């Protein structure tokens, strides 16, 4: 028959940002957290700690950041 | 000393090359001056004091 009424509902908002659009945005923050923490990997690599922290776990790029020079070459 | 590790001479190479010198060393409990045998920290000597 004839609808003399809209029903709805107002959603969850706090301003410009909607829950609908971090959930369409969310997958991306993701991927954008991952992008940033290549960058920061980028960035730490001629770094020791992270180095021998993380960096020199990969199976073929492992031996190629360590040193092979004897320690009678070194003053310290 | 230490810049020649590894580049000309191994390390006890240098360090026994630098030993035969003497340094001056920091002065002992009664404060009259002191020497020393010399270590990869210190520099080529000259020949002359002055």
Partial sequence: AYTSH???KTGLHF???SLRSLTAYAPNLMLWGGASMLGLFVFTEGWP???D???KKIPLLGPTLEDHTPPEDKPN | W???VGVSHTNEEVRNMAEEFEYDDEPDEQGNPKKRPG???DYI???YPN
Avoid: V
Wanted: net charge positive; hydrophobic share 30%; charged share 20%.
């Fill in chain 1, 6 to 8: 809209l029903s709805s």
């Fill in chain 1, 15 to 17: 301003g410009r940002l």
């Fill in chain 1, 49 to 51: 700690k992270f180095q």
């Fill in chain 1, 53 to 55: 922290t993380l960096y």
């Fill in chain 2, 2 to 4: 230490r810049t020649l």
């Fill in chain 2, 39 to 41: 270590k990869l920290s």
């Fill in chain 2, 45 to 47: 000597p000259g020949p």
